Amino acid sequence: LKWCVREVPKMCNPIVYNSILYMMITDPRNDMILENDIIKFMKSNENKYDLNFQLRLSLKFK
Amino acid sequence: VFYSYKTFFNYMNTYHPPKPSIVFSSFVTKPFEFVVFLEACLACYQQYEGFDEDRQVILTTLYDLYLNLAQNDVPERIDDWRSRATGVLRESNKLVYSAASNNTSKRVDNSIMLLI
Numbered sequence A: 001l002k003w004c005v006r007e008v009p010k011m012c013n014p015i016v017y018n019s020i021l022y023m024m025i026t027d028p029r030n031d032m033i034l035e036n037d038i039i040k041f042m043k044s045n046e047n048k049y050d051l052n053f054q055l056r057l058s059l060k061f062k
Numbered sequence B: 001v002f003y004s005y006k007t008f009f010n011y012m013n014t015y016h017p018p019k020p021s022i023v024f025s026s027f028v029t030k031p032f033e034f035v036v037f038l039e040a041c042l043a044c045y046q047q048y049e050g051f052d053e054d055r056q057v058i059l060t061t062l063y064d065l066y067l068n069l070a071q072n073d074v075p076e077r078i079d080d081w082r083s084r085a086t087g088v089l090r091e092s093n094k095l096v097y098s099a100a101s102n103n104t105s106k107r108v109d110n111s112i113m114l115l116i
Helices: A002-007 A014-026 A032-044 A051-061 B005-012 B031-050 B054-068 B075-094 B111-115
Strands: none
Touching: A002 A014, A014 A032, A014 A051, A014 B111, A051 B054, B005 B031, B031 B054, B054 B075, B054 B111
């Protein structure tokens, strides 16, 4: 999914970004490196993720 | 403590309003109270065609709240609320199949609903 997003960023939809964000924030485990990578990905590709849904998911996942 | 917006509306009884999600973040805690307000807002926006795409956002928020609801709520009312979200799922058809005639409108894909 990440390779497809990187290679074909022009041909994509917000659904793909939302699904990628949900998959990244699923977090079966916990690690600071994963959080840093998620923050970097969000900063690089901002203005394309649902703020309310992402905030609710983050609050639920703690 | 009203468990439905209809009871609160019964007890209680200008320009273009802003986006209802602008102040949605202020209701982070105590979602039960905000549920009635969200239902009333959705009912008000149901008429007059709901401008454009506002009904989709309202339905998505209501479905997310309903999915969050009854997760750890009262067991007695767990079955009812889970049933109520089914109606939202039916409304999802009205938000997917009957969202628009697709003649000129681009509509709104319920991908967030599928993820939820």
